[PDB]
Structures are given as structure tokens and as C-alpha cells.
């Protein structure tokens, strides 16, 4: 995260850090959607061009964190993965279309003031909240969790900002050059959640997954996000079948 600010404690209890087990390396962000399932981006786990193809045993997730480096005893939970599920039509060769993956934890994590699941949108929430000009929130790391609120950008503006072909499975967000504010999620924040608070039931919904950009927080460029609701059917299929 660049140009954001310190998150308050427990402000994003669904936040998850995805780490390479050894050597130790913060790979991406992720989010807790139930006591056994973590949502992230597929490219964090699979990217053939760079020989990236992690298995369940190559990783650990850290849940409930606020500090970037310190072990938060009795607050954070470190979990192993039972299985990894990548979207079958994840398109890494062209534009990261369907950049989504699910990770099932070996054991369920207990919720606390610092660990709590975010909701996934339904059709009503997607239609009411995913509109240009409305702001969502992205979280990640720079010594403490960072947060930045960013506006969803009109699809034509998103498409005109890049030479990459944008699909219906992505949306973009970030301030335009004439908006006077900055902030963005960077490559290191990939896989993390873009959330929105419903003004109707006061709940937080994960509308996006940080997927890709062309340089963090650049004028006239925007961060791109996996459209979570577009892929909700696949998420439900995996969780229901396991």
C-alpha cells in the first residue's frame, strides 16, 4: 500500500497474509471468508512464466495481524493449508482474467476481536455497491497494516488507461489525476481484499481482490481487481464440494 494510513486495531479482521513457508516471504494478501476458507488471487499461487506453482505444503497464512514483522502472541493465528483451488479458467497468458483462488485451512481458525470473516456479495449487493464514484477500501502492508479508501472508476476510463484487454471479470479503482488524492494497492498487496460497507445493513462485503496494475499509484493508471461477485458461483461450487 502506498499513500495510505495506519489501520486501527481490528479494523480489517478478515485480513490474511500469505507467506512462503521457507524461505520466509510475504507473498500476497488474502481474506478470511469462513473459519476454514481463505480467498486470494490465483497469480499469487500460480504463474508459469516465473516458474511459480506452489503446493499446499509450501505456504502458511497469518491471520489477525496488525504488525508487519512482530509475532503477535495470543492475537495472530498461523495456519497450514489443506488444499489450494485455482479457478479453472484463470488466464495468466493474456491479462490475469479470473484471478482468483481458494485455500482451505488444515484446521478451522477460531474467531476473535482480531479474526472475523468478511461477507461475500450477492447480486443485490454487487449491483448496488459496484458503481463508479463509490469508494471501497484496500488493505495491505508498506510497520503496521495500511489502509486506503479508493473510488471505483468508470469502465471506459479503466479500459482507456491501459493497453491490456479488460474483461467483465475485473474492475478498476483509484483516484483520477484531477481528484487531488492518491493511494493504491501495489503488487505486494495482490490477493488482498477490496471491501465496501453496505449503507443498508452496515456489513462489510469483499467486492474485489487486488489483481494487477502497471506501477503502483501512478497518475492516470488504476489498480485492477478481480470482480468477486462475477465469480461467486465458482467459490460456492468449491466450498460446497470441498
Amino acid at each position: 500500500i502506498v499513500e495510505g494510513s495506519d489501520a486501527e486495531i481490528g479494523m480489517s479482521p478478515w485480513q490474511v497474509m500469505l507467506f512462503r513457508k521457507s524461505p520466509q516471504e510475504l507473498l500476497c494478501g488474502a481474506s478470511l471468508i469462513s473459519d476454514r476458507w481463505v480467498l486470494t488471487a490465483a497469480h499469487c499461487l500460480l504463474y508459469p512464466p516465473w516458474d511459480k506453482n506452489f503446493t499446499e505444503n509450501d505456504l502458511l497464512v497469518r491471520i489477525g495481524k496488525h504488525s508487519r514483522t512482530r509475532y503477535e502472541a495470543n492475537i495472530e493465528k498461523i495456519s497450514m493449508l489443506e488444499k489450494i483451488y485455482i479457478h479453472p479458467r484463470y488466464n495468466w497468458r493474456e491479462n490475469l482474467d479470473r484471478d482468483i483462488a481458494l485455500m482451505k485451512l488444515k484446521k478451522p481458525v477460531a474467531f476473535s476481536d482480531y479474526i472475523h470473516p468478511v461477507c461475500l456479495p450477492d447480486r443485490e449487493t454487487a449491483a448496488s455497491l459496484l458503481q463508479a464514484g463509490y469508494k471501497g477500501r484496500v488493505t495491505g502492508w508498506g510497520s503496521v497494516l495500511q489502509v486506503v479508501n479508493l473510488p471505483i472508476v468508470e469502465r471506459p476510463v479503466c479500459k482507456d488507461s491501459t493497453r491490456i484487454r479488460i474483461t467483465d471479470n475485473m474492475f478498476c479503482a483509484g483516484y483520477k489525476p484531477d481528484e487531488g488524492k492518491r493511494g493504491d494497492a501495489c503488487e505486494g498487496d495482490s490477493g488482498g481484499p477490496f471491501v465496501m460497507k453496505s449503507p443498508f445493513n452496515n456489513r462489510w462485503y469483499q467486492m474485489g481482490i487486488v489483481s494487477w496494475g502497471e506501477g503502483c499509484d501512478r497518475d492516470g493508471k488504476y489498480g485492477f481487481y478481480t470482480h468477486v461477485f462475477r465469480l461467486k458461483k465458482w467459490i460456492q461450487k468449491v466450498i460446497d464440494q470441498f
Binding site: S5, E8, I9, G10, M11, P13, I33, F111, S112, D113, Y114, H116, P117, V118, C119, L120, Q131, A132, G133, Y134, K135, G136, R137, V147, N149, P151, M196, K197, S198, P199, N202, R203, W204, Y205
Partner: peptide, 30 residues
């Protein structure tokens, strides 16, 4: 069921420091 309601915020009727900006975007952003 209890998804999206934070223990230290919505559950205690406390707002974080910037959520007001998100709610305002529903009025002002479009």
C-alpha cells in the same frame, strides 16, 4: 451469518476513522 460485522467496531457501535468517507461516497460520488 455474523460475517462483515467487526467485533471492535460494528459490534460495539464504534466507527473506524475513515468509514465515513465510504458512506459519503454513496451520496457524493454518483
Amino acid at each position: 451469518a455474523d460475517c462483515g460485522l467487526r467485533p471492535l467496531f460494528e459490534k460495539k457501535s464504534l466507527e473506524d476513522k475513515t468509514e465515513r468517507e465510504l458512506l459519503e461516497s454513496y451520496i457524493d460520488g454518483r
